[PDB]
Amino acid sequence: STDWKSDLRQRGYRLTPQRQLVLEAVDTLEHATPDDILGEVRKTASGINISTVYRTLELLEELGLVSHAHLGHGAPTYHLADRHHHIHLVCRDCTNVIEADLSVAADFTAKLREQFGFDTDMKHFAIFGRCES
Amino acid sequence: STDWKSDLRQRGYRLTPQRQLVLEAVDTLEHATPDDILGEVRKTASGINISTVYRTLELLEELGLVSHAHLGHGAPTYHLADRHHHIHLVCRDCTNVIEADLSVAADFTAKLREQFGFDTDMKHFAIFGRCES
Ligand SMILES: [Cl-]
Ligand SMILES: [Cl-]
Ligand SMILES: [Cl-]
Ligand SMILES: [Cl-]
Ligand SMILES: [Cl-]
Ligand code: NI
Ligand code: NI
Ligand SMILES: [Zn+2]
Ligand SMILES: [Zn+2]
């Protein structure tokens, strides 16, 4: 979201250059891992290490600006809280992830909400399978 | 499966004590992590380290005796290839995983097989959500 600066200020928070760089990286990268972010941020702040990237992501997530989702091997990837609202389908071979509108699981989630009293988004974890493509 | 010994021999393979210990641990533990396995195996072979546990699991999985599935945070847990054929539902708070017959997703998987040409088991990765319990 591009209103992040006013929202944080209205809450007493400001992002230092390096924190903004990490936020930009998560924005720019799409499905970025902490290490991908490290690489991207170094193009501006070469002196940054991964522990700083780990903490900034923890902070940004807690602040509501960033969110994570798991992909292959259950590895978490970061994206802005407002983007990537859907289901990822991980292929059992092709290095490609297919994104699918979560409505495409409207009944399923409902079936779960009843038979188990379990409410799910279908977003946090990916779904592994085989793809004809 | 309790026929593992004859099947491996009929393929030219035998498990040393420590390899059998790890196989027993995966059997005994239910949703065990490499570290849980390490702990369990040490009760018989105290001198074993985790790297040995990592390789034995890799081997056993490749051999077909063991299989893994992801739970909370996308962490892989090991079980015997023949067991745990179902869907895990990870609660957004309670330290409990609910197992659900995968038929309880018969339509959903089908819906995916068509609209995306994606064939999925629903087993490999867990489903995160909220549980009334
Ligand atoms: Cl703003
Ligand atoms: Cl992006
Ligand atoms: Cl046997
Ligand atoms: Cl078990
Ligand atoms: Cl992981
Ligand atoms: Ni896996
Ligand atoms: Ni997570
Ligand atoms: Zn996505
Ligand atoms: Zn299970």
From TrEMBL, chains A, B:
<feature type="binding site">
    <location>
        <position position="131"/>
    </location>
    <ligand>
        <name>Zn(2+)</name>
    </ligand>
</feature>
<dbReference type="InterPro" id="IPR002481">
    <property type="entry name" value="FUR"/>
</dbReference>
<feature type="binding site">
    <location>
        <position position="85"/>
    </location>
    <ligand>
        <name>Fe cation</name>
    </ligand>
</feature>
<dbReference type="GO" id="GO:0008270">
    <property type="term" value="F:zinc ion binding"/>
</dbReference>
<dbReference type="Pfam" id="PF01475">
    <property type="entry name" value="FUR"/>
</dbReference>
<keyword id="KW-0238">DNA-binding</keyword>
<feature type="binding site">
    <location>
        <position position="31"/>
    </location>
    <ligand>
        <name>Zn(2+)</name>
    </ligand>
</feature>
<dbReference type="InterPro" id="IPR036388">
    <property type="entry name" value="WH-like_DNA-bd_sf"/>
</dbReference>
<dbReference type="InterPro" id="IPR036390">
    <property type="entry name" value="WH_DNA-bd_sf"/>
</dbReference>
<keyword id="KW-0479">Metal-binding</keyword>
<comment type="similarity">
    <text>Belongs to the Fur family.</text>
</comment>
<feature type="binding site">
    <location>
        <position position="88"/>
    </location>
    <ligand>
        <name>Zn(2+)</name>
    </ligand>
</feature>
<keyword id="KW-0862">Zinc</keyword>
<dbReference type="GO" id="GO:0003700">
    <property type="term" value="F:DNA-binding transcription factor activity"/>
</dbReference>
<feature type="binding site">
    <location>
        <position position="84"/>
    </location>
    <ligand>
        <name>Zn(2+)</name>
    </ligand>
</feature>
<dbReference type="GO" id="GO:0045892">
    <property type="term" value="P:negative regulation of DNA-templated transcription"/>
</dbReference>
<dbReference type="GO" id="GO:1900376">
    <property type="term" value="P:regulation of secondary metabolite biosynthetic process"/>
</dbReference>
<feature type="binding site">
    <location>
        <position position="86"/>
    </location>
    <ligand>
        <name>Zn(2+)</name>
    </ligand>
</feature>
<dbReference type="InterPro" id="IPR043135">
    <property type="entry name" value="Fur_C"/>
</dbReference>
<feature type="binding site">
    <location>
        <position position="99"/>
    </location>
    <ligand>
        <name>Zn(2+)</name>
    </ligand>
</feature>
<feature type="binding site">
    <location>
        <position position="94"/>
    </location>
    <ligand>
        <name>Zn(2+)</name>
    </ligand>
</feature>
<feature type="binding site">
    <location>
        <position position="91"/>
    </location>
    <ligand>
        <name>Zn(2+)</name>
    </ligand>
</feature>
<keyword id="KW-0804">Transcription</keyword>
<dbReference type="GO" id="GO:0000976">
    <property type="term" value="F:transcription cis-regulatory region binding"/>
</dbReference>
<keyword id="KW-0678">Repressor</keyword>
<protein>
    <submittedName>
        <fullName>Iron uptake regulatory protein</fullName>
    </submittedName>
</protein>
<keyword id="KW-0408">Iron</keyword>
<keyword id="KW-0805">Transcription regulation</keyword>
